[PDB]
Each structure stands twice: as C-alpha cells, then as structure tokens.
Symmetry: D2
Subunit: 249 residues, 4 copies
C-alpha cells in the first residue's frame, strides 16, 4: 500500500508545495490547517481528483495550551483513521511576527511562537513515535537562526528549540527506525504583507541568483530526506538558502 504523511500548515505556500510533492511521490497526505479551511479543502480536492482517497484535511490550532497534546495526538490519529499508517511527519506550520524586548499579551505571543515552532513539533513527534519501511520526520527550520532579524526573539528562540528537538529526537528515535532531520530555508516565499521594494531588498542579498527559493525548491529537500536516498541521514539540517547565511553584514 501507499505510505502516508502528515504535513502541518499545508494549505498554502511551502507546506502546500510539500504536500503536493509528497503526493506526486506516491504518499497519501493529511493536510493540516488552522484558519485556511477553503485552501485546505481545495488542495485535498485537487489531490483526490488525481487519485481518490489519497488526501484528507485536519484542522487544529498549534498554539501551546493544556489541550495542545490532545490536538497533536488527534492530528496523528487522523492519519491512522484515514490511511491506516503514518510514515512521515513534516513540521511546517509556524507563526512569525516581532516581539520587541523594549516598548496580544506576551504570554499569548509565547504560546503562539514557541507553541507552533517548537512545542507542537515536540508533541507531534511524541504522538508519531508512540503510534508506531522508512519512517521519518522533517522539521522546517531557519538558516538565519544565528543571524536573526532584530525584534524577533521569541520566533528565533522557537526555531533554535526546533534544532534541539531535531537533534534530541534523532538520537532517541533512531532505535525505533525513525530518522529526524531538518530543512532550513533562507528566504523563500516572501511575506504577503511585505511591500515590493522590501521584497527586492531581500532578493538582492542572495548570492545564488539574487532571488528567493521557490516553495518547490524547499519541498525538493524534504522529498530527499524522506527518501531511501537518505536512509543513513538523521539529525542533519540541510540549508536551502542560496548562500544567504554565508553573507556578512
């Protein structure tokens, strides 16, 4: 039978491209979404038009709270309910906004930024492992974590914690045959709210091509990590950043 993957935040942008490319590869997919119901449903319909019964949606808020463990367990359970197995988890969903140190509550910001970027990946990892071929987890990291944007402390803290998770889970889950790796974009699809002049400023920084990564280029690295061509790779984080992280101030 066909393997099955969960992709978080899969309705739009990079998560959509990952879900598409996994499906093209032969996976059945759970399209997790939070607010983007119409886009999630439209994607599942597109994938099911290609092969019936190969895509479902699953709604969840991945903000940290006392029920986040239950929500994460339910996302994994939704893959077993639909497809009878769960071979790949892709932790893609992520909040991003500034949290300046000097002048939503700050605890809501902690819950959203650390919850989506770190705690939900951790809880999803627990539930993936507990509910258990070529099993693997891919975490969407950030190649610029050590040269961060000013005023983004909580986002940066969350992405650093996700590197720690990737490493710790690779070590702990290797005996169960589950590999755990990361893909670290530099700039890929730019923020919807960002003006054209600012987008071009970011583009001009990238050595390879002076352009952002497509979503498909990011997804290409995810497909490699889940493939049989990566069977001895665990704990690794692949930068897909066009050289951006090597550029000095």
């Amino acid at each position: 039978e066909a393997p099955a993957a969960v992709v978080t935040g899969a309705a739009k942008r990079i998560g959509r491209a990952i879900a598409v490319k996994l499906h093209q590869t032969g996976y059945r997919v759970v399209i997790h979404y939070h607010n983007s119901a119409e886009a999630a449903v439209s994607l599942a319909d597109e994938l099911n038009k290609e092969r019936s019964n190969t895509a479902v949606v699953c709604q969840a808020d991945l903000t940290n709270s006392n029920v986040l463990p239950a929500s994460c367990e339910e996302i994994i359970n939704s893959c077993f309910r639909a497809f009878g197995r769960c071979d790949v988890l892709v932790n893609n969903a992520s909040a991003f906004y500034p949290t300046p140190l000097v002048q939503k509550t700050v605890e809501t910001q902690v819950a959203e930024l650390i919850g989506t970027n770190a705690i939900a990946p951790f809880l999803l990892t627990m539930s993936f492992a507990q509910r258990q071929s070529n099993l693997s987890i891919v975490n969407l990291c950030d190649a610029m974590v050590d040269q961060p944007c000013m005023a983004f402390s909580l986002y940066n803290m969350g992405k650093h914690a996700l590197v720690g998770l990737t490493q710790s889970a690779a070590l702990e889950l290797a005996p169960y045959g589950i590999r755990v790796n990361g893909v670290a974009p530099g700039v890929s699809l730019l923020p919807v709210a960002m003006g054209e002049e600012e987008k071009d400023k970011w583009r001009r920084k990238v050595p390879l091509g002076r352009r952002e990564a497509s979503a498909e280029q990011i997804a290409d690295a995810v497909i490699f990590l889940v493939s049989g061509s990566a069977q001895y790779i665990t704990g690794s984080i692949i930068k897909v950043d066009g050289g951006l992280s090597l550029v000095h101030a």
Copy 2:
C-alpha cells in the same frame, strides 16, 4: 556607588557561587530562589554580615504561566527597590529531568521551557525596560549539540536560551547592554548521583578528569560582566574542560 546584580536560582550550587563572587567583586545582590528559602536567607545573612545592606532575597516560581511576566518584572523591581539600580542579570535557575518521547507533559513544558528559556526572556525584557556597564549572562550548556538521551525538553530550552542570547545581544546593543553566555560541561554533579556514576562523568573530561567547581563557572561570569569584556556581546564561553570536543 556600588552596582547591583540579580542572580536567579542563587540559593545553592552554581548560582550561590556566582552571587558570592559578584558580592566579593563589589556588587549588591538579589538572591532569587524558588523552594530553597532557608539557604537563600542564610546566604543573604552571610553577605550582609560581610557588608550591611548588600543582599536581599526574592522568591519566585519561574515555571511558565499567565503570571510569569509579572513575577519576572517583580524580580527586577526588587533590585531597583533595594539598591536603586540593576546593572547585571544572571539567568542561572534551571529545571533538569528526563522527558522521554516514548506531571503532565504540559507541566513539564512549562517547567523546563519556562525556567530555561521563557523566564530568561521575560527577565531580559524587564531588565532592559527599566534602563555604566550593563550586561546579562545566561547559563547555557556546552553539551547542547550532543544531548543526553530522553532530555528533549531540557535540550530544547537550552537551545532556545542560545537563541535569546544572540537575539538579545543584537537588539540591546544600541542601549549599551551586552548579552553573553557561560556554558558548563559538567560542573557540580547531581547530589543523588552515586560516586561510581560521578566518576564515569569525571573520567570523560580531558582537562584533569574532574568536573568544574561552581567557582570556576562563576569566574567566567565575573569576566563577562567586567570592564575586560566591554566589546564582548553575543558570545557563549564554554567552561567544560574540553568535554564537548570528545567523540563517542
């Protein structure tokens, strides 16, 4: 006038040695503690016997919760109320216990990610908002990239603290606040640990086959807050006897 410092988890072990050394250097100290009230008060009394009105205690749980921002604002405020200034913040307090992937898990998240990362972040916000050689020192972990098995939430917290160190160094540089870390390998070993297990850790350390004293950790904190470190920000100094360089 004498500068003042806040040290979190200062009643015992490394945080106690840091508070002692800061005091010996000339700082007035806030000794934060959670459960260890008798040891925090005994330290305060020792330091005030050495020089009157130079130490106070401040109790707080640094577990993450809806009240943690207020608690961290109150720790910093305690230094201003006692001493009229707050020049140094040492984020030392830390929960450490296994969280296997295969207390509720959300309590473990609150304790391990709150003490190791969120409380340092909120303390950093409160310190900066209240603002000469100002600096913050974060107690990191030199083994964060070769972590102990089954310690994912602790490791996640310590990685998040590296990110805070860097992000806060960059954002607080314009205000003249330096932000750095000290990363022990093994220093004071857990008190429950049998000597046979302690000796196994000691044997791994290239430099002397022995754990760091708390005082050796504190010496790196004293350097980073001193005028000999005035250009250092965003740096994490390993104090690990070469342990992180040892392969499996």
Copy 3:
C-alpha cells in the same frame, strides 16, 4: 550532450561508488587516481562496457608541491579534452593518518594531509571555475570535524580548511552559477570496527559508500538547484552522541 564529472580518488571505496552512481545517472566521468592505476582502469572498463567512451582515467599526485597547480589544471583539462565540458567536480581524494603533537618528515605530512585534503581541492576549484547548465562542486568533508580523533591534528586541520573552502567558494562562485557543497561521512567504509558500529544511533543499517554517493547525487541534481554552501552529514547520527 551528457554532462561530465571529475571524481578525485575514484579508484576505490567512496570515490568509486560516487563515480559509479554519477555514471548511472548519465554522467561521463574522469576517474582520477594516484597509485591505483589497475583499479582505475578496471572501473573505467566496467563503465565503458555499459556506455562506450563515457569514462576516462587521469593520474595525478595530489600532495602539495611546486607542480600541484599544474597537476590540478591537467585533471580539469582532461575532462574538457575527453568530453568537451566539465559540469561537476567531486573532491573525494584524501589522506588520513595520525600526526601526534608530542613524540615521513612533518613537512611531508603537511604536504600530504593539508595538500590532498585542502590545497588540491582549492586548486581544482580554481581550475574548474576558470574553464567555465547545472554546475557544482561537492567536497567530501568529515562529520566529526568538531569532535576530532586524538593525535589527528593535521588531518583535522585540513578538513576544517575544506569547510572554509566550501563556504568561501560557494559565495565567490555563486555569480557564475556554480554551487559548492559538502557531504560529511561519519563512519563509512572502515580503514575495532565493531566498536565504532555499536555507537552509531542508526547502527541497525550498515554504513555504505553508496549512502555517501546518494547524497552527492542529490547535491549535483536539479533537486538541489538553490543549495550552496551546505554540508550534509551522512553519519547515522554519530556526531550527536556524547562521550
């Protein structure tokens, strides 16, 4: 036309596996060797039996010396002469032995360890770029570079230098569309063996040269067109394991 690749130290072990997989992928290949002429020619015979005139050999000593720049220019030129193009350079050749700090001359050891592991990759990079589509260079790094083996100072130095070359050349050659990346094995083909295997988290799977070659195939592919300056560890998780 089919793209072409140079693989250094391609007669045996990892380099041989890389050459085979590039050839299977559709590359024409230059098989570099120093001492292993019989194995280089045996490999070329196997590859040419599959597709005629798709594999040649090239002899060079990659020890640093006054003639190393000309040797490296000749390896690159051999690819252009055989195949009319040179799309991929894999810097695989490497010397490995201990050089204790406290007690071949030490300067011969510098020439071999630093020359084969770092300087010849630098000179090959220069010649590859100067003679220039999906162009890329892949350097064989070491996943244990920051947890080095005791008494291997010069080997470790040269592998660190190779990381610096990977990064510096990625930046400088990006405007030319040449990507520069690394693959960092941990324990692959062993030179006591069991001791090492039991420490690898993914130790249920034997380490293989083909697994290393798979990462090289990804990095040279169109699936890696935005990837430059990246070093992929292929080590079963070994570098995550504390002492």
Copy 4:
C-alpha cells in the same frame, strides 16, 4: 620567578597590545617579528625600561617551507634561552590578502604564506611548546567572521578554519599535559593601514555594540583572561570579541 610568554607578530598592532598587557600582568615576553625590526626593538626597549631583562626579540619568517619546523623550534628555544621557561604561547602573526578563485606571487607562495602563517606555524609552534615542557596555555588569534567570509579571501579563510581545528585538536591532545589551548576571535579591531576612512567607516557602522572597531587592548583583555587562573577549566574554547558583528545578517 616570573612566567614567560611568546607572542608572534608582536611588533605592532594587536600582537604589541597582547605583549604589553602580558608584560603589565607580570610575564617576561619574547616579541617575535618578521619584517618590523625597528618596531620590535623599540617595544622591547620600552618594556625593559619598565623592568630590566623582561623582554627580548626573536626574528622569524613563518611562511611554510621545509625549514619552518626548525624556525618554530627556535622561537620556543629563544624563550627558554632568555627566561628559562615558556608558559604561554600566543599565535598572533598572520598574513592577509586576497586570492581570487577566478582570474606578483605564485599561487604556491600564497599557499605557503597564508596557510603557513595562519595554520602551519601555529601547529609547529604548538608541537615545539609542548615538547619543550603551573599554568601553561596557548591562545590562537582566530576570526569571528570565518563562517561569513570576505569575497576572494579563500586561502586566508581556509587558514583561519584550520586554526579552529588546531585549537580544538590540540586542546584535546594536550589536556593530559595540563596545557590549555583556546582562541580569541576578533570581528573588526584595528583596521588595515591601507584602508581609507570611508571604507573603515563602512565597517564601523556594521558593529552593533558602539558602531566602532575593537581597540587592540579589548582583544588583549580576552587573551589575558584565557591565560589567567580565572580560566583554569577552559580549554578548546574560542571567545568572540566582535561587538555582535557576527550576528548581523546581510
């Protein structure tokens, strides 16, 4: 009896600052130099005027060659010859110039100079320091920007990366001998003498902490900490002294 230190490339700039601060701390010093004879002697005269017989000069080219091991052995021997002991080695001397990958000295001369001064001579001096053997240590002058390198400086960057590898490998292997091995990694400190003020200001404006380069004494302060008793458990560590520069994105 006062401890003794060797500082390479100590006639001017950062290496002079390091020699001066070690001397102020109580060390006797060997001021190594290559071409800067007048500045080396000037400095040793100043230090000797402060306390007699506490500074000597030693001349040596640190370019790689088949004689480099003998030169490095001789530098260490000069410390024992003058002072009877050698407690600290500071590997400061360093060539720096561009070596573009795509197109005067031959490339092999550039290799010998850039990799010799930045890496091979530190390795040979480390071997001779250890063989000739309490608070013994080595400090290597690294570069905080080694992972965000300047365009066209590949050989310099390769040499600094190799020096990180040496720092770590020598820390591990020399720990049983009680010799600590650490690094200090400037971002921008004293700017090139050839650089125009406009270009210097471009660099200064990038630095978060103060929008200025490190003084030479700020770099020396980190060296003095690492050789001190306050660092007695620290080995294999590289301290950035960079004002936050390495944290700044493109």
